[PDB]
RNA sequence: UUAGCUAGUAGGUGGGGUAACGGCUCACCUAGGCGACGAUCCCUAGCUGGUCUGAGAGGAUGACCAGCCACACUGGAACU
RNA sequence: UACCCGCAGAAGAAGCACCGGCUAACUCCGGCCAGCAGCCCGGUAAUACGGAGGGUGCAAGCGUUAAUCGGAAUUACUGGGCGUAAAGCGCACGCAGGCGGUUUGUUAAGUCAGAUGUGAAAUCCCCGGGCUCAACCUGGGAACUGCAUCUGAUACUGG
């Protein structure tokens, strides 16, 4: 652009839109499980992904993934969600295992801190 | 006793009636370490043969670079098809601040201190071609001094 | 229309050098003659002469060394659309000192190192490497 | 904040003796030095550029027993100082108190030298200094305290150091159990099999 | 010897006062181009001496009204 | 009034006072007019811990500035030592 | 994807008022003033030295520390 | 209290993440399910799932998430483009605006030079000092790339 064209209208920095807008610049958000169900992946993959819908404390209603093998999550369960999408279109948040309603994945021995599993004492 | 360096090995393929025919291309660079550097590019149906062809083509087709105490004479710009390259002389002790292909070229060429940056496409072949074109177009104070028909008091 | 005759002189020099022209001719001017003087005393052109009285015609004799162009690069820095003025402590050096930068200081048109030794800044006319 | 596990594992991984043992034997008689540790030690895979840079940095760190935060701060200060960054880094590494005590001859290994320093058994200019990372300046005098001169550890270390090479920048008297730090070592005085430029490129990427 | 300004009169409809436009040449802080900038000032013009277009020399004084804080010194060029 | 006093800078348990000329209404470490010296109360006697300019101090006292008790003792000791 | 805004409004004379200049206020007169260099309107926001990042130019930011401002349940007002 | 001295005994003190490529680190065992995933595995010998052994990286911490800049020359002033990849208004006239051939004189507005005032302290950076070292504290300096004023220069832009 001509220097005069920039003087009259400067460069407009491209604005980046968040990928986790329901957190509102917070690392975690608390919400209640509205509906717990399963979903089928997309194309290449084939499974039954454990997912849940949760109304957050700021009013946002989002679908959140439940990682790990096995979960005891029912309706009205108040869980803690964090960012991190599932590549399962639509799901953009993860449920923190070991956070105030979601028990840790039982029988974990490796990467326990990622699933809220206490260290097995000898 | 020149140093030889393999920069990139890439597997290309041509399709025929029966199926795909996979061959390998290797891009290398050689240099004596005091101002001579040349790159070679060989395609072959196998990796060691491709590297051998690249080394033979690189041992020939070598250019001369006018170094200045192990660094560039002046900031130079090298350009090939998609890659635009900027190199700048640094002081003693900085090292080679450059990408992979640029690091290989400037290291086998004999350059010890340089601040470099690769713009556009970072394609290894075009990056080394731009680096070579920028280094061979770099002139020394004696060259400009003799080309101006005046002494070298600018040095 | 013709709104930058100095850039036109630089372009004529560049195109005559790329076409292996022996000499280039152009309408003359005081600033053109000063820049041609700076180019000749630095060794980028062989000679220059101004012919004509009512319509002076400036003729620069281009220079070659090995059948190659003596002027590798010549760029207009300060231009009508964007004027570039520099102080003496920030005068530019072309080719890390191997090239020249024609600067128009209050004591006439001179090179960047001459303006530095004279303790002067001014308008950066062009870069000649 | 310390490495307490196996010592020869580090030298086997680095493919080079790191002087992690005193020297009553050859390392070849205590371990397979030419073989990397673990079940897959017989294999040797082609190292990348990042692999070589990381391995050289780890070799230097394990030689001097410095963790990553302190080594990063060492590189920061070396890049801050004037001159070549690599020799500045190696000089900063050699200036440590436990390193000098080991080089002085009062420690069979840098681990027992660090134990001598930390246990308040080493003096600097008559002042008991128990910091292993204490930067020793030229003309400093390093000595064993009166209470620790009776230990056989220092005697065995003195003997083991007499069977070693003598550093040019250390004037040590084994009788008085004291030494003087004359000057910082130049690049030509340290080991020649340490590529400082690899560490500089690793930390400047 | 007193610090002053200079501009052209763009309005004299008011009584005992004029509006002087001080044009200045400023380099753009980003793109380096020298752009024109206009500073319009309500100037006190007693005797109603200045017409539209006069290049006048003004100086700053105490507030004389809600918007007037500059006063006239002399007229340099007179609307022709 | 204008007063000449100390502003307690430094670390915890290791104070370092800056002799400042300040309007007595401001905070201790707040807005001051001019710094006219310092005072290190835990100096090792090997170095200097009292470098307060007496010229500007006397100039300000001549203008009605008040001297705090600690600064008065410091001026007395600086005059005695020098 | 806000283009027209403004009646104490702009200026002048005089009275008053303030510690002080001043439409600060009042009477009268003149008919102006702001605006495409963004007036008006709408949304957001304490400002700065500085902090983070960056080779730099810049981008983001304004917790602690220091300067300035504003507020003191909400709205208004004066007294000393 | 800092600091110092004595006692006893290895005695009271190592975890977290990762190991397909990017990216340092590999084997065994249990079926597109369970599951992993920052971007490109699992349909019955999976270095990618889960467990074990081994190893790698950090270490009183280690990871994940959220947020800013960098890489991103990916808003390109430094430092990008528009025939076919996104991009030349369908074409023209034309006000504001931007720019403007050549010579002389004059001015000194832009520009340049010098000086003065200011640019709070802290912070940043440099040389030292004190805390056993460091963090931290601190002396001095540099810097604060800015603004105003005054005196000159006249090549270029402007009047």
Question: Pick from E36, E49, E40: which is nearest to E69 by CA?
Answer: E40
Contact E33 A7 (CB under 8 A): yes
Last residue of a domain, one of C71, C86, C119: C71
Q: Is the CB of A118 under 7 A from strand H?
A: no
| Closest by CA position to C57, among listed C36, C82, C88, C78 | C36
Give rounded-to-5 percent helix, strand, coil for chain F.
25, 35, 40
B25 SS3 class: strand
Provide the CA E66 distance to its chain's centre, in angstroms.
17
> What sign does the dihedral B59-B64-B69-B75 (CA atoms) show?
negative
Helix/strand/coil for B131: helix
On whether the CB atoms of residues E19 and E11 are closer than 8 A, the answer is yes
Contacts with C66 (C-beta within 8 Å, 6 or more apart), sequence order: none
What CA–CA distance (Å, rounded) separates E66 from E68? 6
Burial pattern E22-54, b for ≥16 Cβ within 10 A else e, equals: beeeeeeeebebeeeeeeebbbbbeeeebeeeb
Q: Flag residues 38-97 of A with CB < 7 Å from strand H.
A: 38, 41, 44-50, 67-70, 82-88, 94
| Measured torsion, CA atoms of residues E40, E45, E49, E52, in degrees rounded to the nearest 10 | 20
Strands A28-39 and C122-128: unpaired
Neighbours of chain A (3+ CB pairs under 8 A): C, E
In this structure, the dihedral spanned by the alpha carbons of residues F51, F55, F59 and F60, taken in order and rounded to 10 degrees, is 0
CB contact at 8 A, C109 and C35: yes
- Residue carrying the six token digits 């043992």: D21
Give, as one character, the DSSP assignment of residue A17: P
Q: Are D194 and D56 in contact (CB under 8 A)?
A: yes
Task: Of F64, F66, F56, F12, give the one whose Cα is nearest residue F34.
Answer: F56
Angle of helix D152-162 relative to helix D110-118, nearest 10 degrees, comes to 140
Shared-domain flag, residues C66 and C98: no
d(CA C62, CA B74): 25
Neighbour order of strands in the sheet with F66-67? F34-39, F14-23, F2-11, F66-67
* Strand H contact at CB of residue C16, distance < 7 A: no
Domains belonging to chain A, first-starting first, are 1-122 (2.40.50.140)
DSSP label of A20 = -
DSSP lists the bridge partners of residue E5 as E58
Strand H reaches within 7 A of the C30 CB: yes
Going along chain D from its start, the domains and CATH numbers come out as: 7-93+190-203 (1.10.1050.10), 94-181 (3.10.290.10)
- Answer whether any strand H atom is within 7 A of the Cβ of A11: yes
For C43, how many CA atoms within 13 A lie in the half-sphere containing its CB? Answer: 15
> In the numeric block, which tokens belong to residue A72?
């005891």
DSSP classification of residue D184: P
Q: Do chains C and E touch (3 or more CB pairs under 8 A)?
A: yes
Q: Which nucleotide is nearest to F7 (CA to C1')?
A: H121
Q: Which helix (H) or strand (E) holds D188?
A: none
Q: How many residues does chain A have?
A: 122
Chain B interface disruption, residue of D82, D197, D203, most B CBs within 10 A: D197
Considering only residues 29-88 of chain B, list those whose CB is below 7 Å from strand H.
Answer: 84, 86
Which letter, b or e, does each residue of D70-82 get, where b requires 16 or more Cβ atoms within 10 Å of its Cβ? bbeebbeebeeee
Q: Are residues C108 and C62 in the same domain?
A: no
Go through C1-34 and write b for each residue having 16 or more CB atoms within 10 A of its CB, e for each that does not: eeeeebbebbebbbebbeeeeeebebebbeebeb
CATH of the domain at C114: 3.30.1490.10
Tokens standing for residue B155: 């040095």
Q: Which of D25, D22, D43, D21 is closest to D34 using CA atoms?
A: D43
**Number of helices and strands (H, E) in chain F?**
2, 4
> Do the chains F and C touch each other, judged by at least 3 C-beta pairs below 8 angstroms?
no
Q: Say whether the F–B interface has 3 or more Cβ pairs within 8 Å.
A: no
Same domain, C67 and C80: no
In contact, D136 and D97? CB cutoff 8 Å: yes
Which nucleotides of chain G have an atom under 7 angstroms from any protein CB?
9-13, 21-24, 30-35, 37, 58-60, 65-68
**Do residues C97 and C66 both lie within one domain?**
no
**Does residue B69 sit at the C interface (CB-CB below 8 Å)?**
no
Kindly determine whether residue A3 and residue E35, on different chains, have CB atoms separated by under 8 Å: no
User: Strand runs (DSSP E) across D16-165, as ranges?
Assistant: 122-124, 127-128, 140-144
Query: How many domains are there within chain C?
Result: 2
Q: Which of chain A's residues have a Cβ under 8 Å away from the Cβ of C79?
A: none
Which of A56, A63, A70, A58 has the alpha carbon at shortest distance from A84?
Answer: A63
E strands of D19-164, at which residues? 122-124, 127-128, 140-144
Q: Could you give the 3-state DSSP secondary structure of residue B118?
A: strand
Please state whether C47 falls in left (phi above 0), alpha (psi between -120 and 50) or beta.
Answer: beta
Instruction: Say if residues B80 and B63 touch (Cβ distance below 8 Å).
Output: no
Pairing relationship of beta strands E55-60 and F2-11 according to DSSP bridges: unpaired
Which pair of tokens denotes residue F56?
């500007």
Tell me which H or E stretch contains B62: none
- Residue D97 near residue D129 (C-beta atoms within 8 A): yes
CB–CB contact E34 C83 (8 Å): yes
The C-alpha torsion from C105 through C107 and C108 to C109, rounded to 10°, is -40
Chosen from C79, C80, C82, C87 to mutate, greatest number of chain E CBs within 10 A:
C82
Angstrom distance, D151 CA to H14 C1'? 30
Beta-carbon separation of C84 and E32 below 8 A: yes
Chain C residue with minimum CA distance to E27: C83
Q: Cβ contact (<8 Å) for C97 and B154?
A: yes
Query: How far is A53 from A73, CA to CA, in rounded Å?
Result: 11
CATH code where residue C44 lies: 3.30.1370.30
Residues 6+ apart with CB under 8 A from D184: D91, D94, D95, D138, D169
**Cα(B146)–Cα(C63) distance, integer angstroms:** 13
Asked whether the beta carbons of F17 and F5 are under 8 A apart, the reply is no
Which resolution in angstroms does this entry have?
2.7
Question: Chain A partners of E33 at a C-beta cutoff of 8 Å?
Answer: 3-4, 7
* Percentages (nearest 5) of helix, strand, coil residues in chain A: 5, 30, 65
Q: How far is the CA of E60 from the C1' of H159 (A)?
A: 24
B100 by DSSP, 3-state: which?
Answer: helix
Give the structural domain span for C93: 72-129
Whether D8 contacts D22, CB under 8 Å: no
For residue F78, give Cα distances in angstroms to B2, B82, F45, F73, F75: 73, 74, 14, 9, 5
Q: Which residues touch strand G (CB under 7 A)?
A: A 13; E 11, 13-17, 19, 23, 29-30, 36-38, 40, 42, 44, 62-68; F 26-27, 29-31
Give the Cβ contact number of residue F47 at 10 Å: 7
Q: Are residues C61 and C86 in the same domain?
A: no
User: Which residues from the 134-153 window of protein chain D have CB within 7 angstroms of nucleic acid chain H?
Assistant: 134-135, 147
- Quote the tokens at residue E76: 């340099």
Strand H lies under 7 A from the Cβ of residue A24: no
User: What residues does E39 pair with on adjacent strands?
Assistant: E22
Give dist(CA B151, CA F48) in Å, integer.
Answer: 58
Q: How far is C54 from chain B (nearest CA, A)?
A: 34
Instruction: List the 19-78 stretch of E: residues with Cβ below 8 A of C.
Output: 31-34
* Residues on chain E touching C84 (C-beta within 8 angstroms): 32
Nucleotide nearest to A23 (CA to C1'): H66
Contact status of C81 with chain A (Cβ, < 8 Å) = yes
Spatial separation of the C-alpha atoms in residues B32 and B38, rounded to whole Å? 10
Q: Is there a contact between B3 and B31 (Cβ–Cβ < 8 Å)?
A: yes
The structural domain count of chain F equals: 1
What is the rounded distance in angstroms from the CA atom of residue C115 to the CA atom of residue C124? 11
Asked whether A32 and A76 are in contact (CB, 8 A), the reply is: yes
Same domain assignment for residues C15 and C61: yes
Q: D61 φ, ψ to 5°? A: -60, -50
The C-alpha angle with vertex D51 and arms to D46 and D55, in degrees rounded to 5, equals 115
* 3-state per-residue secondary structure call for D121-149: CEEECCEECCCCCCCCCCCEEEEECCCCC
Burial letters A92-113, b for 16+ CB under 10 A, else e: bbbbbbbbebbbbbeebeeebe
Sort strands F14-23 and A28-39 into parallel, antiparallel or unpaired.
unpaired
Range of the domain at F75: 1-81
Cα separation, C74 vs D140, whole angstroms: 61
């Amino acid at each position: 652009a001509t220097v005069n064209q920039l003087v009259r209208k400067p460069r407009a920095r491209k604005v980046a839109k968040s990928n986790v807008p329901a957190l509102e610049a917070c690392p975690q958000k608390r919400g209640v499980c509205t509906r717990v169900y399963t979903t089928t992946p997309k194309k290449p993959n084939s499974a039954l992904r454990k997912v849940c819908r949760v109304r957050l404390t700021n009013g946002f209603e989002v679908t959140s993934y439940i990682g790990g093998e096995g979960h005891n999550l029912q309706e009205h369960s108040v869980i803690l969600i964090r960012g991190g999408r599932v590549k399962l279109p639509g799901v953009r948040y993860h449920t923190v295992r070991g956070a105030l309603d979601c028990s840790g994945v039982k029988d974990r021995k490796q990467a326990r801190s990622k699933y809220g599993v206490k260290r097995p004492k000898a | 006793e020149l140093q030889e360096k393999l920069i990139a090995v890439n597997r290309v393929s041509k399709t025929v009636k029966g199926g795909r025919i996979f061959s390998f291309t290797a891009l290398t660079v050689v240099g004596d370490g005091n101002g001579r550097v040349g790159f070679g590019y060989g395609k072959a149906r196998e990796v060691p043969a491709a590297i051998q062809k690249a080394m033979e083509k690189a041992r020939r087709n070598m250019i001369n670079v006018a170094l200045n105490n192990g660094t560039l004479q002046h900031p130079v710009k090298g350009v090939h098809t998609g890659s635009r390259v900027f190199m700048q002389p640094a002081s003693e002790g900085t090292g080679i601040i450059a990408g992979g292909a640029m690091r290989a070229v400037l290291e086998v060429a004999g350059v010890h201190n340089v601040l470099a940056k690769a713009y556009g496409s970072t394609n290894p072949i075009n990056v080394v071609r731009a680096t070579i074109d920028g280094l061979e177009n770099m002139n020394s104070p004696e060259m400009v001094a003799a080309k101006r028909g005046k002494s070298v008091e600018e040095i | 229309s013709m709104q930058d005759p100095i850039a036109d002189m630089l372009t004529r020099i560049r195109n005559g050098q790329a076409a292996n022209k022996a000499a280039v001719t152009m309408p003359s001017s005081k600033l053109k003659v000063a820049i041609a003087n700076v180019l000749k005393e630095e060794g980028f052109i062989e000679d220059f002469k101004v012919e004509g009285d009512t319509k002076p015609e400036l003729e620069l004799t281009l220079k070659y060394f090995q059948g190659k162009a003596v002027v590798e690069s010549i760029q207009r820095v300060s231009r009508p659309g964007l004027r570039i003025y520099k102080r003496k402590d920030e005068l530019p050096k072309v080719m890390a000192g191997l090239g020249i930068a024609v600067v128009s200081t209050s004591k006439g048109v001179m090179t960047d190192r001459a303006a530095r030794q004279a303790g002067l800044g001014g308008e950066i006319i062009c870069y000649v490497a | 904040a310390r490495y307490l596990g196996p010592k020869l594992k580090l030298s086997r991984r680095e493919g080079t003796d790191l002087f992690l043992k005193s020297g009553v034997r050859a390392i070849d008689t205590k371990c397979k030095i030419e073989q990397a540790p673990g079940q897959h030690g017989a294999r040797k895979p082609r190292l990348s550029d990042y692999g070589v840079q990381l391995r050289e940095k780890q070799k230097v760190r394990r030689i001097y027993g410095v963790l990553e935060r302190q080594f990063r701060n060492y590189y920061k200060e070396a890049a801050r100082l004037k001159g070549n960054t690599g020799e500045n880094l190696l000089a900063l590494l050699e200036g440590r108190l436990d390193n000098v005590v080991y080089r002085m001859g009062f420690g069979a290994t840098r681990a027992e030298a660090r134990q001598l320093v930390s246990h308040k058994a080493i003096m600097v200019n008559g002042r008991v200094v128990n910091i292993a990372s204490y930067q020793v300046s030229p003309n400093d005098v390093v000595s064993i305290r009166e209470k620790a001169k009776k230990q056989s550890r220092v005697k065995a270390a003195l003997e083991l150091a007499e069977q070693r090479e003598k550093p040019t920048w250390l004037e040590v008297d084994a009788g008085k159990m004291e030494g003087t730090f004359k000057r910082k070592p130049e690049r030509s005085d340290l080991s020649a099999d340490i590529n400082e430029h690899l560490i500089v490129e690793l930390y400047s990427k | 010897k007193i610090r002053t300004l200079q501009g052209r009169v763009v309005s004299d409809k008011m009584e005992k006062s004029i509006v002087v436009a001080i044009e200045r040449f400023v380099k753009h802080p980003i793109y380096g181009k020298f752009i024109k900038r206009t500073t319009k000032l309500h100037v006190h013009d007693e005797n109603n001496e200045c017409g539209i277009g006069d290049v006048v020399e003004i100086r700053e004084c105490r507030p004389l009204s809600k918007t007037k804080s500059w006063t006239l010194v002399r007229v340099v060029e007179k609307a022709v | 009034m204008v007063t000449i006093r100390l502003a307690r800078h430094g670390a915890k348990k290791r104070p370092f006072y800056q002799v400042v000329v300040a309007d007595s209404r401001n905070a201790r470490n707040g807005r001051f007019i001019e710094r006219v010296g310092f005072f290190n109360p835990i100096a090792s006697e090997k170095e200097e811990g009292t470098r307060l300019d007496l010229d500007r101090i006397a100039h300000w006292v001549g203008q009605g500035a008040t001297i705090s008790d600690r600064v008065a003792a410091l001026i007395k000791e600086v005059n005695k030592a020098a």
